[PDB]
Design a protein around this ligand. Structure first.
Ligand SMILES: CCCCCCCCCCCCCCCC(=O)OC[C@H](COP(=O)(O)OCCN)OC(=O)CCCCCCCCCCCCCCC
Ligand SMILES: [Zn+2]
Ligand SMILES: [Zn+2]
Lengths: 32, 392, 51, 30, 32, 28
C-alpha cells in the first residue's frame, strides 16, 4: 500500500521544520 | 428493471422513470437512477460557448480599486502568477485546478466524447473522470469569495465593477445550469448497451464506477467498464486511516505558521489564521462569522466525524446508525466549501499590491492548509457506507 | 562585552536622527565584543561610537 | 433550447469585435 | 490504472510551473 | 457538531477576556 507512505514523508517534513525551528529558535537573553 | 443499492446493498426492482420522476433506495433513501434530461448536442453547444466566453472572462479585470490615487486592475491570472512568482507553486497549481482547470477539462472531455462519436476511440476512463469531476467545479465558490473580498476592502479604497464581471457571472450561470442536467448513466447506456436481470439473483454486485448491476466475467472486470468488480472497496479502511492521519498532522503547521503577511509602511504584520480571524471579528464581525464557520469549523467537524466513524467501525456500535449516514452525507456535502479562504487571500493579494505602503503576501502556511483540505476531501470520498451497514 | 541600545527617532537640533527608525518603527541595536559569557545585559543610552 | 447558445455566441462575437477594434500603434523611444 | 489519469495530468501542469520557476534565474554574484 | 465548536470558541474567548479582566478605575 503506497498510500501508507503518504503521511510519513510529510511527517519527516515536519521534522525538518522542527530542525528548521531549532535553527530559527535560539537563546533567550534578558535586557534591562 | 432491477438493480442494487450502491450504499446499503438493497436489491430492488426498478420501475420505469419519466422526466420529472426520480428513484430512491427503499431502505436508505439514496439517489440511484435518472434519465431523459437534455441531449449530448446541447451539452456540446454549452461547452463550445463556454470555450468562447472563458478567455474574455478570465483575462478582463474583475474590479478596479482606486488606492492612494492609483487605479489597480486585477483578475485570477494575475493573482495566480503572483503566487507562482512568490514561490508557492503548489498552492498556485491547486488554485488553478480548482478555478480555471476544471471547466477546461470539462470542455475537453465533452469535445473528446463528441469526437469519439465521430471516430470511435476508447472512452472508458473519460466517463469516470466526467462523473468524478462534478465535485471540483467550484466557480460559484469563487464568486462568493470575490463578493466577500469586495466587502472586506470596501472601507480601504474605492471599488468599481469591471467589464469582465458580467462575463464571469454569465460563465458561472452557464456552468451551473449545464452541470445541473449532466447525466452519466444515460451516457453509459447510450454508448454501451446492456441487458437487465431476472429480478431475483442474489449474486449481482454494484460497480463503484458506473453503478451497474451484473455478474462479473471470467476476468473479474465489470462488463460495462474495464475495472475489477469487488463486493466492497479494496483497502478503504487503510486508505481512509492514512489520509485522516495525514490531514490531522498537516493541520497543525497550517494553523501555527502565518498565512498572510501585510507589509505596512515597511513593517510586516505576520499574523496567523487565528490572529486574522480575531482581527476580522473585531472589525467586520458580520462577515467574520461566515468566514469562521466556513474556514475552521468545517475542517475540524470533518476530522471529528471521520474519527468517530472509524471508531464506530472498530467498536461495532449499532446505537446511532440512523444518524451516522446523515452525518456522512452532510460532511460530503459541506467539505467542498472549505476552499473559500485560499480564493479570498488570492484575490486580496492580487488587489492590494502597493509598492511599499501596502504589500499583501501569502505566507508559508496556505500550502499545508490546502493539502489538508484535499486530503480530508479524499478521505471522505474514499470511505464506504457499506462497511457501516455491514457493521450491524 | 556586548552593548545594546534602543534606536528611536527624535527631533534633534542641527539634524534629525533615526530616520530609518521613524519610517520602520523603533528597534534595538546591538554591538558584539570579546567577553567571556553573559545572559543579562544593561541597555545603554546614546549608542556610543564603535569605529 | 438553442436560444442561449446563439445569444451567448452573439455576445462573444460582439466582445471579440470590440477587442479587435481597440488596438493602437507601437512606438519605440530612446 | 485508469484512475491515475486524473492526477498525473495535473502533476504535469505543476511541473510546467516548476519549469517557469527555474528559468527566471541567471548568474548568482556575491557582493560585500 | 457545529454548536459544540461554537460554544467551545465562545468559552475560549470568555476565558481569554477574563484572564486579564483587572480592576476598573474611573478617571476625570
Ligand atoms: C494540486 C491539486 C490536485 C488535486 C487532485 C485531486 C483529484 C481527485 C481524485 C479523485 C479520485 C480518483 O479519481 O481516483 C481514485 C482512485 C482510488 O479510488 P477508486 O476510485 O479506485 O475507488 C474504487 C475502488 N474500486 O485512485 C486514486 O486515489 C487517485 C488519486 C491519488 C491521490 C493523490 C493525493 C493528492 C494529494 C494532494 C497534495 C497537495
Ligand atoms: Zn440503500
Ligand atoms: Zn463498471
Amino acid at each position: 500500500s503506497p498510500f501508507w507512505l503518504l503521511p510519513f514523508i510529510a511527517l519527516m517534513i515536519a521534522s525538518w521544520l522542527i530542525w528548521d525551528s531549532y535553527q530559527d529558535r535560539g537563546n533567550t537573553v534578558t535586557i534591562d | 428493471d432491477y438493480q442494487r443499492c450502491p450504499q446499503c446493498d438493497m436489491l430492488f426492482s426498478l420501475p420505469e422513470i419519466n422526466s420529472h420522476q426520480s428513484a430512491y433506495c427503499p431502505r436508505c433513501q439514496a439517489k440511484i437512477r435518472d434519465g431523459r434530461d437534455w441531449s449530448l448536442t446541447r451539452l456540446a453547444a454549452m461547452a463550445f460557448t463556454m470555450l468562447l466566453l472563458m478567455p474574455f472572462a478570465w483575462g478582463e479585470p474583475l474590479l478596479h480599486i482606486w488606492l492612494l490615487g492609483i487605479r489597480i486592475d486585477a483578475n485570477v491570472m494575475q493573482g495566480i502568477w503572483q503566487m507562482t512568482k512568490q514561490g508557492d507553486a503548489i498552492t498556485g497549481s491547486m488554485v488553478f485546478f480548482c478555478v480555471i482547470g476544471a471547466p477546461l477539462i470539462l470542455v475537453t472531455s465533452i469535445a473528446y466524447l463528441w469526437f469519439g462519436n465521430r471516430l470511435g476511440m476508447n472512452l472508458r476512463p473519460v466517463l469516470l473522470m466526467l462523473e468524478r469531476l462534478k465535485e471540483w467545479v467550484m466557480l460559484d465558490i469563487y464568486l462568493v469569495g470575490i463578493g466577500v473580498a469586495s466587502i472586506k476592502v470596501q472601507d480601504y479604497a474605492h471599488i468599481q465593477a469591471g467589464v469582465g464581471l458580467f462575463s464571469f457571472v454569465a460563465l458561472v450561470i452557464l456552468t451551473t445550469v449545464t452541470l445541473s442536467h449532466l447525466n452519466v448513466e444515460e451516457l453509459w447506456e447510450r454508448f454501451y448497451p446492456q441487458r437487465p436481470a431476472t429480478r431475483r439473483d442474489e449474486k449481482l454486485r454494484v460497480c463503484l464506477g458506473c453503478h451497474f448491476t451484473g455478474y462479473p466475467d471470467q476476468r473479474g472486470r465489470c462488463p460495462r467498464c474495464h475495472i475489477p468488480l469487488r463486493l466492497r472497496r479494496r483497502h478503504s479502511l487503510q486508505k481512509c486511516w492514512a489520509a485522516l492521519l495525514a490531514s490531522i498532522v498537516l493541520l497543525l503547521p497550517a494553523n501555527l505558521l502565518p498565512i498572510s503577511i501585510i507589509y505596512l509602511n515597511g513593517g510586516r504584520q505576520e499574523d496567523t489564521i487565528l490572529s486574522g480571524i480575531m482581527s476580522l471579528a473585531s472589525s467586520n464581525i458580520a462577515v467574520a462569522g461566515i468566514v469562521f464557520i466556513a474556514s475552521i469549523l468545517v475542517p475540524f467537524t470533518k476530522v471529528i466525524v471521520m474519527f468517530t466513524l472509524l471508531l464506530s467501525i472498530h467498536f461495532k456500535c449499532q446505537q446511532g446508525l440512523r444518524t451516522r449516514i446523515l452525518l456522512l452525507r452532510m460532511v460530503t456535502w459541506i467539505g467542498r466549501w472549505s476552499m473559500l479562504d485560499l480564493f479570498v487571500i488570492s484575490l486580496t493579494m492580487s488587489l492590494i499590491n502597493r509598492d511599499q505602503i501596502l504589500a499583501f503576501t501569502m505566507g508559508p502556511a496556505a500550502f499545508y492548509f490546502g493539502a489538508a483540505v484535499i486530503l480530508t476531501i479524499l478521505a471522505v470520498e474514499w470511505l464506504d457506507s457499506r462497511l457501516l451497514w455491514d457493521a450491524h | 562585552e556586548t552593548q545594546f541600545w534602543l534606536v528611536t527617532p527624535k527631533a534633534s537640533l542641527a539634524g534629525v536622527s533615526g530616520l530609518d527608525a521613524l519610517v520602520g518603527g523603533n528597534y534595538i541595536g546591538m554591538m558584539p565584543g570579546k567577553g567571556k559569557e553573559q545572559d543579562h545585559f544593561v541597555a545603554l543610552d546614546t549608542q556610543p561610537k564603535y569605529r
